[model samples]
Structure formats: C-alpha cells, structure tokens
Target chain A: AAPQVRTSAPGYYRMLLGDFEITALSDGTVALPVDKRLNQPAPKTQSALAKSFQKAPLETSVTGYLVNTGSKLVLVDTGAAGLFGPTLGRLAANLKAAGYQPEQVDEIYITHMHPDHVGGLMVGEQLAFPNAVVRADQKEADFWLSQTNLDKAPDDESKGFFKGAMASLNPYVKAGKFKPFSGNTDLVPGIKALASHGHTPGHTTYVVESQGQKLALLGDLILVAAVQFDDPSVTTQLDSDSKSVAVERKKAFADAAKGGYLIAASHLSFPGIGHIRAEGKGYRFVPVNYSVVN
Target chain B: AAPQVRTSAPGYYRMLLGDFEITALSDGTVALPVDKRLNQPAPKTQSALAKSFQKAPLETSVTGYLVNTGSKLVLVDTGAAGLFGPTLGRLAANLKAAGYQPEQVDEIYITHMHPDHVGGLMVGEQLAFPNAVVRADQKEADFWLSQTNLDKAPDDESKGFFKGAMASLNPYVKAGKFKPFSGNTDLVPGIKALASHGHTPGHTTYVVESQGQKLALLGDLILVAAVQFDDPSVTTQLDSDSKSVAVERKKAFADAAKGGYLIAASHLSFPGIGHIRAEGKGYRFVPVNYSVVN
Candidate 1:
C-alpha cells in the first residue's frame, strides 16, 4: 500500500496567567521577503538573522489569543481571512479545535484595522462572531472607515486595505456591534487597552490583568520577533512610520523587561508568551516552556 | 449567553529537511519534580532552571517525530500510550491530526526501549501500527525482553518498566514485525543509526539525510532543553548512568553544532526542531523561526 504524509497540527496552545486562561491560536503563516521589508543595513539584518538561525523570506506566524477572563471570552486579533490567500485564515478552525465556537466569544478587541488583524472579523459579508461586540481604537476606525481616506489611498494595494477594513467591519457596524474606543481605557474589569500607535493611526496593545499578574497582548509591536528581539531598532516595511514603530517598540521592550510581565504578540512564534530581558543594548526572547497547568 | 473556554491546541508541526518531510508529533506532557531525579547539586540545577525561565517542578513535553523519505513513511518513536496516565497518550490522535493513519506507517525506528519511547507500539494488546516493521538496537531488546533481567528488577516500580516493555513489544515480536539491529547501520536510504548509549544500555540516535542536508532525531539526548542546553552535565535521574549520559550528550551537542544540522528530540519543546550553538562554555538552543514551507 502507498503511504500518505500528514499535514501540520492544529494551531493553538493554552496557558494560565493567574486566574486568566490564555490560548494562543494560530491563524496559520505568511512568508515575506526580509530583504525587501526590513529597514536596516543589510549586514546588521543578516547578522541578527544568523544569530536567530533564520534566513531570507521570513515566514511569519499569523496568530491570535483567546482570553477566558472568567467573566468573558475575548478574542484578541483575528487572522487574515481570505485576504492573504490559503496560507492563513485558520484561526476560526483552530478556535474550534481549541474547543470554542465563534458565537461563544463575548467580545473582540482588534489591535488595529490591518487586513491581517481585522480580516477574520467576517466571512464574506457576515460577522464571524455573531454574538460579540467588536471594539478597536477610535483612531483606527476613524482613519480606515473614512470614505475620504479610502479615496485618498495612493494605489490599488492601499485601496484594497481600506476595502478590506470596511468589508469586515461594516456588517458589525450595521448590526450596532462595532464600538470604537479612545486612547487607553478599561474594556472590562480585567482587560485594558494601551495605545501604541505607529503601524496604524491607532495600533493598540491589550493588557490583561488578573490576580496581580499581567500578560500584554502586543499586536504587531514586533514582527519577526527572532530578528527584532535582538535589535529593536530594526524596522519592517509594514510600519507606517518606522521611527515611531522603533520608539514604541523599545518602550514596550523596556516596560515588559522591567515589569517582568508575561508578553504575548501576534507576530511572535505561536504560543508566543515569553519573557524579555535586557541584553547587549537590545533584548532576548525566552519562549515559555510548555506547561500543562491550565 | 455564558462563555466556554477551550483547551490547548493539537500538537504537531510540519517542516521539510531538504527533500524529506519531517513532522514533530506531541505525546502530550508530564510534570516531573526535578529535585527527585536530577543527579546534580540542587543549587546548580536551580540556577540553570532560573536562567532558562523554568521552575523546579519541570513540565516535560513528551514527543516523537515522523519522517517521510518520499519512498517510506517512518515514525521514529511512539509515545507512551497509557503507561504514564491521562496527561499523555495523545500521540495517536495528533498523528492523525498531522494526516497519517497508523496503518500507513511503513516503518518505526525506536531510539530506545524505555516505556515512554516504545509503549505506544500497542494499544491494549493490539498492534498500533500493525503494518510497520519495528526496529531498535539489539541490546535494548535483549535487556528489556529478558526474563532474567525482569526478575532482577529491584522493586515493583522497577519491574513495571519491564512489564511495559514486554506489553508493548511482545505482540509485535509474535507478529514477526520486531527487528532489532546492532551498533550503527543504515535503517534505510536516508536514515542511519548511531549508538548513543547510557540513558539505557542500547539508547540510539537516528541521523536522517536527504539532498545534502541532515536532521538528527536525538531521542532523549537532552531532556530539559531549556536547562540542559545551558549545562549539559546536569544529569537526570532517568539516566542509567549519569556520567555516560553527560558524555554522550556533549558529543551529540558538538556534532550537531559543528555540522550545522537541524535536530529533533523526543523531549525538547513540541515540534522540537532547532539548531544548537556553542556559547559561554556550554550551548544554546535556537528554535527554528516559524515557517510556512513544507
């Protein structure tokens, strides 16, 4: 009989942070050419890549986190659904594999309006999480949902980004489920938002607090954690303002390091909970050892 | 509506080693109180654990690897089916998640005869991979399958180890599927064995090669990668001879580092493919950056 090779495992991992249950869900992965996007000197970028044992055409894990705050089931960031092709859009399937139904999510806090982060909000013209209230930074909604900005988009590629945003959120908007928030505010008793804008007009980070512990759900704060953790100044082409992204990233790194908080990122490795420690003018990522406690 | 939290993700990841496809399968995890089993001084073990961001009660990921060499579907080690209790025995489910049926496996090359490494060979007196040719080091079979040795076991706990071996392998032997090989030899065109003894009398390592590249499946070579990679001399109580385990581990570490080959281990993190490098008189593990290519 002929042999049949298997596909990769379903993407998701569970951990406990104090009283909160966090599950890292893989939306799958996308590959990008590092040489074209990384805004750093070739040698410096190459050196960091070598140190991390990575190569060109970086493959990024497009992931999201599911937080069970005892009181609510919150999804932070969804994967690129149908926008980035078949390589991604597994978040819904993975969420199910993790023993969840989309309707079970009480709320969703998107980091921004990027296609990768917000695209999973819907399937075609329907809200993916029909029973959830959708929230994002007000600035993010104002910037992306504006028809003037949509027309001002410089190219088809830029216009497509705006179209994706509207396509995903408009259904929720009509259903009165989308509620944009301003600055840093408490979304619930245990979840708070931190405005860390740069990649978008209002890129935000969610800080989940429970039982005196914190797990920062950093959205696109550092893509390609392998390279950026070694040199925070290294910027990716996806950043709207490289300088702002770099500065915000450094601050996030210091805050995480100083506070000794568990950090989760959308673009870090899957189950991307880890510690960041100051090292050689930069920082190092220590992926959490696998645990079964949760 | 009330919210429902989910469990962790399924354990499996797929990658390509040149032309050969490698899938890391998780056998679930088990928690071990390090103080009881480690041969090193408490302080040294504690310090190493501290540096690696792990705590005293170490949670170990029990894992195995599946290699597809174009012509054959080969599984390296089967997980503990039910020997270790409820926390484990997920390998078969995960193997299916990775897309292969047990019946499709053409061969299985076991690293050792330890219960955790070989117990999955059967599922309640039934052959798990009924069609596969099972192979292991000849000495491993002799020591575990010998009735004299089973009687010589010091305690009931020690005797259970012997019982598990016979329970998992004897059925295969009866079916004419168990084939033990000696020393180092080619198990197939791309897989060859290396005698890495001490953890058990006949512990072995398999070096898989294809298209000028290599990936070593170092079964149990370094159990607590987070801690052991930093101090290879820190021995676990599971070792039959701590001194020999340390020596063989160091050699395997150096060979992997010097040759720049990818490595998969039975007990590194799940999907435990990584590169090892010399650092600070010890070594460091660099987990592969997430990739989409298969």
Candidate 2:
C-alpha cells in the first residue's frame, strides 16, 4: 500500500558485557580500493573479493564502540567527521539515534590520532562533546598534534592529515581537557589499554571487561576484514609501519583464536564482534549471533 | 545523561538484492538445550559450545525475511509468534520498526508449516496480514492442517501443535487467503520454492534471485548453526526423519558452498545471511560483513 523505505535502520547495535552495556556505533561507510593499497598483488585481493561475491573498491564500514560502565560513559573513538566526504561523518547523528548525547559522554578514548579516529572531536571550531575529556597515547599526540610535524609534512595530503588532527584536538587541548597516557594503562575499572603501536606511532587497543565477559576493541589493526582475516600478513598503505602492523596482526588474530574472547574490529561491519578460529595456516572469523541485549 | 536504553536497536537489518530490498527481521530469541536434544554426544556439544565461548541452553535466534521486489511485498516466514513463549512473536513489531506494517504485505511465504514458521499468520481470530495471501507447500498444509492428523496425534504435546496450527492458519484457509503450491514452484519473479522435505513432512526452501545475485532461504534444514555447520549429520529431536534430514543438510550445504551465493538460514542467527565454505568433510558458516544498505 505504501512505497519503500529507502534508508537503513539506525546504525547502532547493543550488547551486554556482564554488567556494562556496550554499543557499536556506525560512522558510515566508504568505498576503498584495497586491491591497490594491499601489499599483496592486486590479483590476490581481487581473488579474495571474487570468492566472497564482492569487488573493489570494497565498501568498508567505520565502526566505533561506546562503553557505559554504570559510572562512566566512555567512547572508544570519534568517527571521521566529514573528513573523507559525504559518506563519512555519521557518528554523532547515529549516537543521537542510539539515544545518546555527545555532552553525556564522560570520556573519549583515542586508539590513535588519525583523522578517522579523532576528527569527530569538534564541529567546526567548537568541541563536539562539550563535557568530555579526550585521551590518547602520549606518542600519538606528540606526533600528529605537533606544530613541528605539520610544518615538516612532505606533501599537501600529508599536511592535511596533520592539520586535521590539530584542528580536531586543539580545542580540547586549549581547554585543558586533553589527557594523554603512557603504555598499557588502566583508564577505568574495567577498561585497560593494550599497546599495538604499528598502524600508527601509538596505536593501541583496549580490553573492556565486566564480571567475566571480556571484549577487545581492536582499532584499525585489521582495516580490511575480507583480505586481512584470511592472511594477516597482507598490509595496506594505512599502516605507518606495514611490517610491524603485520606482526601485530598475527599476534592479535592468534590470541583472539586461542583465548576465544570477543574481538571487535573497528573497520569491520557495524558491531563487528566475533570469535577468531585458527584454520589451517590462516584463520576464519565467526560473527556473534545477532540478538537484542536486555 | 539518560539512563541506559536497556534494549537493542530494532530487530531489522536491510540490504539490497539487485533492485529488490531485503530486510532481515528478528523474532526474538530463546535459549534451547541442544546438548540434551542433539544427536551428538553431550560432551561433544559441550566442547563445541566451550570452543565458541558459549554454553548449553544456547541462546538461539529466530529470524525471518521481508523482500520488497518493486511489484510485491513478500515475507519469507511469520516467526514463532508466542508459540513457544514470550521470547518470540517480535516479527510484526520488527516489521513496523523497519517501516512496514503487516497489512501492507502482499504475500506470506512459508518455508514449512512448523509452528515457528506459521504461527505469526494470525494474531487472534483475524488474519495478521489482512490483505495477504499465505503460501506453503501443498504437502505441508496437507500434513499439518488435515483433521485426520490432528485426531491421530499420539499425545497431548503432539495434539497441541496441530491445534495451534489449525487455530493460526485455519482462519486464512477459510477466508480463501491460503494458497498452497506443489514442490519447486515459482510463486513470483525472483522467488521459487525448493524441495527440502525432511525436517517436517513438507519442509520446503525458497530461492530468491534477481540481476545475477541470489539468496537461498534455507528454513530449518540446518536449525542449529553451532553444531550443524560443523557436522550436518548432527540431528535433533525436532527432526521427524533424522536420517533423511542429514542427507538434505549435506546436499544443501554443499550446493551453497559450490554455488557461493548468499544463503540465509532460519535458525542460524538474526539476519542469518552468509556463505558456506567447505572445510574438510564439513562446512563453515561465514556471516555477511555488517553494513547498512543505502
């Protein structure tokens, strides 16, 4: 009787981590030609896509996690806010759709100071989340948030990244709301940062636990789930140290498989929570059975 | 800040199949004790659950599909509809959440006449989708809806199933809204019935295709994703003919693997769409990477 609804449901999935509630928020998707960026030959990525009935450029999701620990509301990352193009920068709108206001966020944790991770910190010149303290690894802030690095950038593209980071983070910094931390430190009762410094200078992953349930918020460690899950050795241009990131990927995937703990990949489809199974020389990912958390 | 929402996002996931739009609607979840019911040894089921970081009385999802194919609004199953308990009957609510109402549906396609598949056909004494035609395999309606079978039911439990089916589907049958078809019939463009008569007397599946993209709606052929994907031979008390269902499972899984098309299992998980990858003598279920359709 009526016409179709052309859009999708609100981009948020929620699950309980024992006593804490975790929400996987979407930051929208972007099409990236991973075949060109992956270290493996173009044919390898093409074959991977074909096996999955997909093609390059692959539609990649930018997902962020929000942890409500009863006492605190901690967001894992600020999504890329109009940084890439129109398809990007949906995190805040989605947050509202998920019944949250940016001002209610108690803390913001940055895995790394990349544009996609930190760019949502501000809307134009004003801070996006007015009442939140921003935190990242000390090394990441020193590198991307430094005037010296922006001045010495090799090209306009590189300079844009540096400039964006400064613009997004400087508002909080000027207000004395920026709080950089050292290696593998515990920020809250159930959230602990894990050092995974390869994708960026201070790239980190966080382990969120409550009661006995544990979840690893792996940020950008595996940007392309299609190609990387099958062969973690495959690196992309996004990795500052491709070789080092490959080593970290091996360890992350292996530990996830062995421990059987939940691992959520940022670049995976929304709410990318799954178990890693070591299969032959490679690995396979089994997604969580979808259900509402009550 | 507002208190936590204490629930999940709407139980619908949307994606595109060529020009058609498909929505996966979740009908809530129930915890079932597969260790006691499965043909596999109790230890095997326990180990399987342990390996996946889950336990017995597994929380299983009941999901259905709605396809908007321009000219038609087709729903694959009606969901459990309070047949089992309160942790069911969410299909209509989810449909509305996905920007649709039951009365707007043009057709209702039942993979089989199981209580979970057909129970949502009616809400009380009236048709749930007042304007829709309900369809199922002729053999299914014959076996479940016939008075002879209801009279011959061995016990109270068996009789209740017949009574429930009659109560739910008889309303449509009397109103001239029930249309049962023979095996392997095309009900509409891009939707064809497939013979899979083992789990129940007339357990049929459906194939939906358009513009070279395909989807196989495997209803109850593999009900328990945790055990069945690893070993299709693992049957349950629910299977009327365990041996025959095993054969169908193998064939369906292999065909799904070889063809490499999208397959949605009724009992796998909510929006259980994925590919079947052959591993050893068994197979693996790989979920579709999460992304909202534009």
Candidate 3:
C-alpha cells in the first residue's frame, strides 16, 4: 500500500474536578519486572497477573498532572525526564501539548522525590519550570539532601537516587524557588497535602477540592492498578517499608472510596483519572470514559 | 502560567502483530446513552454500568487501524467523518499525526458499511484516501446499495444510512476502486476475512496473521465493552440480529482467548489492543500495557 503512519496519540488529557481544571500529562513509560518488584508471593503475583491477562515485566507509564485552580497553575509530580532512559521525559512536551508552558506553572507539589517523580524538574543544569516554586515534604528533602544519607546510601543505585534528587533540586534551591513544607498543610485554597509516608519517608498525597468536588492525586501508593487495586496489601520492593506502604495504601483506598472522590494516580493508566469503588473486599478502578470534548 | 499548551498527545499508537505493523488511530469520540441502546433491561444495564462505575450515556471513541504488511498499507474501517457530528472526523487528522497522508493508503478493508465505519471514505465529495482501493463484503455492498432496502427503510435515520454508503462509495464505484469480496477469502498475505455477520448483514472480522502471531480486528461485534465483555450475551439495540450477534461474540471471545491473539476493536477503548481472558463464565479485557517506545 502506502507508507505507514509513525506516531502515537498526544500525551495529555483534560478533565474537570468541580471548579478545578486538571490535565494529565505523560512523560512516557518504563518497563519493569512485576515478579521482582511486587512484594507478594511469586505464585500469588503470577496468578493475579494471569487473571488480568498481563505478563511479567510490565510497561509502567510515568504520568504528571497539571492542576489549574483558576487562581494558580499547580503541577503534581513531574515525570522522569531522561533520568531512566529515552523512554521517559515527555512531560514537558506534553505539558505544552496540554496548552501550558512550563513557566506558566506557579507551583509544583511533588508527591515524592523519586527520580521518576522529580526528574522532570530540571533539564540539564537548567530548571524545567524556571518560573515555578517547587514544593515537597521537608522530610523528603532532608532524606535525599542529607550528606550523611548520601554517604550511607548502601550502594551505587541508592547513591544515584540521592545524586539525582540533588541535581534536580539544588539549582532551584539556590535560586530560592524550592520550598519544602512540613507535615500536612493546605498549600492553596483547595489543594491540601497529606502525609502518606512509607513508599518513601516523605511520600505524600495531594487532595484537591473545588466547589465540593475532590480529586486525590495518589502518587505511588498503588502503582500497578491492574494488580494493586485488587490487592492493596500487595506491596512492591520499591517501598521504603512494604508493611507501612500496605497500611497507608489501604487507608487511601478506603478514604477515596468512602468519600466518592475522583482519583488521578501517577503510575496508573494514561490520563489515569478514575473512580475507586469498593468491590468484594477490594477496590475496582473504573477509568473515566474517554471524551473528545473534554 | 505561559499560555496553555492546548494540545493532546498524538492519537495514534503502533504495535507489532507478528511481522505486520499495526497502527491504531483515533477518530475522536461520541457520547451515547447506554441505557437506551443496550438490549438488556433498563435495571440490568444500569446495574452493570454502576458496577463498572460508568454513568449513563458513555462517550464512545471511534478508532481505525492501519495494517502495513511490508508491501502495502491497508486501513481497516474508517471513522464517522461529519456523519455523526463535529466531535468526530478526526481520523484523517490522526492519520496525518501518525505521519502519513491519506494518499499513501493503498487499500482499505471496511468491516461494514455503517456511516461511522465508512464515512471517512470521502471528504465533501472528495475521496479521503485518494489512492486507496476500498473493499467490503459483497453482501454488505448489496444491502446498502439496494434501492429496495433504501426505499423500505422505516425512517429518515435509516434512509440516511443508505444515502451515506452511496455517497461514500459511488465515486469510488465509478472509479472502479471499490472491490467486494466473498466468504472467508484472503485479501492478501497474512490477512483473511471472517464472516462475523449479525450487527449488519455483512458485519465482518478481519484476521491478520504474520510470523506466527495473530491479531483480530472485530468491528462492532461487542460495542460497549465495559459491560458486554463481562457478559457477551448482553446484546445492543443496534444489532441487526441480536441473537446472532451474541453467539458470534461468544465464539469470538472464546476463540481469541484460547488462541491468545491480540484484538483491536472499533469501540472498546482508545488504542484498544488487548488480550481477552476467559473469566468466570464470561471474559475480561486486559488492555495492553501503555508503552513509550512501542
């Protein structure tokens, strides 16, 4: 026939949470082994994966959400911008695709300081969102920035994690654009940060409220929606404390389901905004139907 | 913030089905009332929708697939081009987004002649894929082209269906670029037709095979996957033969699950290529993990 078309859909989707306009931007995806990372028994994890018709070494996407609260342009979690490899780092481009430039962001509330979550904060030695003030839990900043923590990182991999964080944040800190908040607090009129540590010492969840509607931006609390929603206790090896992560995840799920709030997760599917429903001792994720007009 | 980015990620995705390159292109989406169109009782449909956390009248996406077999570019089905409304007619634009222009398509294998499936054939009296030869089931061409059928159509809505087919096909017919096939014939190497009639007299499925791998492009066999997938027997109000559709759907599900072939459906979800697994007397759809490098 003719030459083949060679591209994929744009990486951003827009949705409304009462009066707040939220956009989910893609930074691309990374592949990981479902077998090694998930802290569940081999057979149990395999069985769940089978039931979901998924194969091991899942292609997990890294997502970022842009929240336009009418008064402020806030971004929650940036994607891994080339930190892992070429497969990631599309968030900035997708941010533009969603109709906003990086400089348009007034604030960035990070869910955690993991490389994938904050790598897009910087591009080379330059700040990706130069005009925005970066915010995160003070505990997370202390953990990643501490010279003692870096010296005792245990291995090169853990050391790389610390180095990446500093590299992405140090410049902004020097510029006085990096602001770390302590504990749970209201960052804006309708945006509140909640401490949900365990995945990381400072892992957090941002609860956004507007005109009575709410959307919980759950960062890594439940990464693999395919298996995690069905079994929240199934933790991953990436968690700083698997047991604690499991407990926190369950609470988040219960709270979101009980409150009947919409959720946007970083590692769920693309445009990962969905409603969490209690289903047979677990939760079910119902992705909002894709809409063209939205 | 900087002016909004005002764009979404490209709406096309690429995957490999054996050696054949398959591209799923979006033609945007349309919202329809699930309560009014599904064949189940109002309460039953509502219950299913509720369980799935879907509201009434879902926004359904229109998708088309392009198959490249090294030597030719074959498009399977076309999206509603202004036939439904302005929210659609995005196939051509997405086709370009995927990198190629319409003239590059060498052949188009239409699953049926429904307005939504064939409307992209022409753009305001001009052939959309100017260089392509269109093909469909002989029975499909007969049904839509029949003057008797058009005259007997009960309402303007039904008449519009006939009119649309002719409008899209006549120019090609005059140009002798429209070809009709019969009974499970091989359209080309690794591509074969299967009779999946029920939704329409000539509703069909295209089975594509290459390098020991297989993919099935099922057109409207099971429209509202959110519910139909959980219960294949749950028909739709749009079915030309509800019973036949249910039977065909069950067979398709079983065969796909057993054979472990990837499936691309027109109305399932955006870029909907996934595996079907037999689940508790029915089936479940496992959308292929989103990937950045695919």
Candidate 4:
C-alpha cells in the first residue's frame, strides 16, 4: 500500500564517498502504525513516511539497508526475501537489482536482535546469508538466547520472536558460523559499533565513518519517521527498557543533530538515511537522496 | 532503516468481482513489534508474531479499497498522501491507474477515525475526500469527537489520535458535507454497515451481504493476517478495548470461516479479502479473488 510501492525505478540506489560506494539497497518494507510508540516514527514527523507505501489501510513501512563497501559488502540487516512473503521483502530481489547477490555479502552487521534486522538470517529455517558472517552484540544475543527471558518477556510477540530467532540462528550457532561480538569493536576498517543501547538491552547502533564522511546506523533508535522526529524524548512502549531507552534516544538524536552526521535510521523511511535538525526543543529529519555512486 | 524500505513494491493488487471491479490500493506500511503480553496463546510457547501482511522488517502497510459499484464509483480511504512531502501521494495517481477519478467517486466510506484512514480526508487539512460524502458511523464519531476523553488519554498516541481524528473530521464537519450514518444503514443498495465495534468504540464492520452472496467490510477488527488466522484470541496493542475486541474478532472470524461470506479485512494483507475456513479450534483465511459486484 505504499504510495509508489512499485515505481518503475529499481530498488537499489548508490551514493559514493571517495573510495566507498554506499548502495542503499532496500531489503523490503514492513507495516507499522503511526504515532511512533512502537519505536518507529509516523510519516508526518519523519516527513518521508510515504502514504503511498502503505499496503493495507493502516500500515506504514520500515526499510532495510546495505552498504556496498566494495571488497567488503556490508549488509546492515537482512530483510525478509521478497520471494518469501508480502510486507515487501524485496531485499534479495532488490539486491540483484542493486548489482549484488546473497552470496556476495561478506558481513551482516546486526544493530539489535529485532527480527526485521535479523530475520534475513534464515530463509525457511536455513542460513539465508550464505556468504555473510553474521555478527551481533553479545548482550543482544544474551537477551534473545535465554529461554527464561523469552518466557518472562511480554505476552504478544516475545515467544514467536524467540522461535524465529531460534529457527534463524540455531543452525548457524550450531555450525559455529554465527559470530557474537561484545561491547564496542571495530567491525571493519571504518565501521564502529556505537553503544546506543536500551531500545533493546544491547541494541547496537553503528558509526560507519570513512574518508571524513560518516553515517550513524541508528538502529531502532528512531522508529516511525513521523513520531520520532517530533518527539524524541518519548520512549517507544514496546522498548523493554523505556527509561534508558529514552536516554539513549536523546543521546543518539542530540549527537546526530549536533554532530551533523548522516543518521541512517533503522525505521526511518526507506533507504532510511537522513539528518536530524533541531525543531523547537526536539528534532526533525531531513532526508537526503544523493545520486548513487556520487 | 526498515529492511526493505525503498526497494519493496508498494504492496498492491486488483481483484475483479463480477463486473463490479475492485482494486486494493496501498497507502503505505508501518512496522511495530509485539511481545508475549500482546497475545495470550499456546501457553508457555512463545514466538515474535509478524502479521502475514507485515514483513519481518519493521514495516506494515495501509491499503484502501477502490470499487466501481457499476454506476457508482467508490473509494474506501485516501492514503497518507505521499511519504515525502509532495511526491508520494499517489492514491490520486493510482486511482487513475485503475481507471478511476477522484471526481467520479460517488461515495467514500470510512471504517474508523485513525489518521491513515482520515489523513487523506484533506489535502493539507482541506477535504481530500471532496465530491463525495465522507461517511462513517455516528457512534464512532461520538467517540472520536470527544475531547474530554482525549484529555485524559493515558498515552500520547491515544491523545493525538483523538486530536487527529477531530482535525481530519473538522473541515468536513464545517463544510456540512460530513454524512454520519446509523448502524445497519445501506451505503448503497448492496453495501451495508455490519456494526462490528470494539477495535474503536463504535468501530463498524460492514456486510456486503446479498441474497446468496456476501462480503464483510472489516476495519481493523483483526490486525494481522497470519496472527488473526492462526490465533483469534491474540489482540494487537492497537485495539482500544481488549475484551469486546476479542469477542467481535472471534465472531467475525467464525462467521467468515463457516462460509457464505467473503471478508475484506483492513489489516489482513493488501487488498485484504479472503475466505475463512475451519482450522482446529479457530479458522484460517484463504484469500479468494472473487469479483465484487453491486
């Protein structure tokens, strides 16, 4: 239901910075509600929330991203395959559209343990990221790995999340293919994990800094583009730790706005990169669409 | 960013119903996470539930309906306009794609008062549903119209929802063009209000029930296609009243599954109409491409 869900243009768009070829390849879009409490923003505040993107009468979208670091193609998160289901899991299809392949991905940097960010790990309970080394924070792994916490978690989606994560990661874990990194570490040459935790206990954000150009992989830090941009202080009700969540949110938003970094929001509109500008006491998102390979 | 934000197709499709053509128009998608508390299901067994219409990534869609009731052209809901400021409102453009014109819309039926349903009520708050009598349930209007309850709303969204509902309804009310209908009123000769409340206090579900053929106009009576079909007891956090919501859901699901009715679910999947069938204790939705005619 997104406004030009299938516009003539292909899904992958490239933007260049010196030696870096950043291709904002769409994984696929999911539907959410407006008002942002779900840890996403509404289209109004985000300004990029496309009404045309809605699939049903009340749905909104969350877009996945991939950074083509040339020799090291880093996929931020794996969107559900477009072939699998609806909610626009076109990442695989769009990845092809963007001049890449599932096996071409070298590293899959997970921001948190959320399914949208990690669901691409398994396609029909098999390792979907065939060539990519899946990486996640130990803290995130700990939260998701424990059957107790999963049991104690909320009533709605907690259990299924446990199952999906288990289904997606178990084989990888058993195969010793899944890699868990603790605390902050340099993922590669320019990518650094920014501890913008609390959206989840270890919901990691990323600082993709290179050649004097930088972009913050603000994971679920800013959800619905509309609500988050306007009310950055209000924590998403779905976030387990609302207090720390707000602090981390305020920190990430303030830093992004003050530092003038190209903040790539996990739930911001598609190709979800944008800048945070102060509006009144809060902030606003300024979406910049640079030409691919520019 | 959402897993497949940009690359995903704008989740939409068309279904022919006996010379009475219908198009499932996508407005956009939204993504929200559900925890265990969200749904009381298979005991200690847990899973993070993603509605079938909702992809793994944090995006869901909002789709409207376009139907040509032979002599009368009708539009269900206007999308959020465009995700980006001016470029995204493709509903008008899409209407043209399906050979429909905004001016030719003889009737506009509103299922509820959410912004996604009403945001397109105006172009920048100016009556987007012009040329058609913006119709809704009078009882539902009473709930949305009350600023008193909105003042004490427990959350920002619950509060803003009230405000936005009034904001979208204000102009139409001022123009004296807003048409409030009672329960069981016929929108046309065939389209009738079924009065399925609980999702929103006066929230109405419709029945396009004719002598031997029928279809149900479900407006968020159930949230996700997978979850609703799999677990009828599971209620989305989006519902205002949980108890009644649960009751109505089970009823509608049972009725639809038992046969004799084609159901158009607002949040099921794009173009959300399907036939329900008995599955274990509950039922499952089997999407049917039936031609909806007047």
DockQ of each: 0.46, 0.57, 0.48, 0.02
True contacts kept of each: 0.43, 0.47, 0.51, 0.00
Per-residue lDDT of B22 in model 4: 61
Residue ranges of candidate 3 with Cα displaced over 4 Å: B2-8
TM-score of model 3's chain A, to 2 decimals?
0.96
* Candidate 3 lDDT tens digits, B175-226: 9899899968899888999999998899889999999888999988878887
Model 1 clashing residue pairs (backbone): A7-B98
Q: For residues B218-252, could you state the per-residue lDDT of candidate 2 as single tens digits? A: 98888777778888899988888898899988988
Per-residue C-alpha lDDT of model 4 across residues A1-294, encoded as one tens digit per residue: 112112323455555544566666565454454444444444443443322122222333345667755457788876654332466565667777766677777788878766666777776656777766788888888888788877886877657677656666677788777888887888878788867678787788877877887888877876655455666666667686888878888888888777776777655545566666676878866554222121
Q: Candidate 2 on A68-88: residue-level lDDT in tens?
A: 998889999878997778887
Comparing 2 with 3 on TM-score, the higher-scoring candidate is 2
Number of the top candidate by TM-score? 2
Total clashes, candidate 4? Answer: 108
The DockQ leader among the candidates is: 2
TM-score of chain B of 1: 0.96
Most lDDT-accurate candidate:
2
Error of 1 at B26 (Å): 1.8
Among all windows of ten consecutive residues in candidate 1 chain B, which has the lowest summed lDDT?
A: B1-10
Q: B1-294 in candidate 1: lDDT tens per residue?
A: 244454566677888887788888888898878766777778877776776667867788899888888888899999999998898888899888777889989999999888888888888879999899999999999998999999997887888889888888999999999889999999878999999998998999999999988998889888877568878888887798788899999999999899877888887877788988899879988887666553
* All candidates: TM-score: 0.93, 0.96, 0.95, 0.48
